């Protein structure tokens, strides 16, 4: 919808209600991802490359604490290739990373806010 209506505020109140906390939510930006090669923060690296023992941001964040709410703030700025990753998060509830360990989002909340329109009906 419009800006300044309180989207992130509603998401943080929802995270407040069923954790009594504020750091259980996993906010990841989408204003970082203008470049096409910068996708691998949330997957990892294939075997034979530099960061391999670490893994991924969005996978190691959910291998522990498997009840979090996740946030994708301003998903318009992401160019149309990040949309192909979370295409398979939805409809399956699984994700794979560099080691080949399928993490399962079967009991998490997914909320992704946008900014399209802004004035129309």
């Amino acid at each position: 919808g419009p800006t300044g209506v309180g989207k992130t505020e509603l998401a943080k109140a929802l995270a407040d209600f069923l954790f009594d906390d504020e750091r259980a939510m996993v906010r990841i930006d989408m204003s970082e991802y203008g470049e096409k090669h910068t996708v691998a923060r949330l997957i990892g690296a294939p075997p034979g490359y530099v960061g391999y023992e670490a893994g991924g941001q969005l996978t190691e964040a959910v291998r522990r604490r498997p009840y979090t709410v996740v946030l994708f703030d301003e998903i318009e700025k992401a160019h149309p290739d990040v949309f192909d990753v979370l295409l398979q998060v939805l409809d399956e509830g699984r994700l794979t990373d560099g080691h080949g360990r399928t993490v399962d989002f079967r009991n998490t909340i997914l909320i992704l806010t946008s900014n399209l329109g802004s004035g129309g009906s």
Partner: peptide, 26 residues
């Protein structure tokens, strides 16, 4: 009357190895 009869031994010392971790150069 008693002799000593010295004995042998076997020593082990292994070796580490490194991985090279290529970089995709972008």
């Amino acid at each position: 009357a008693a002799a000593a009869a010295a004995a042998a031994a076997a020593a082990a010392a292994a070796a580490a190895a490194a991985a090279a971790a290529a970089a995709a150069a972008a």
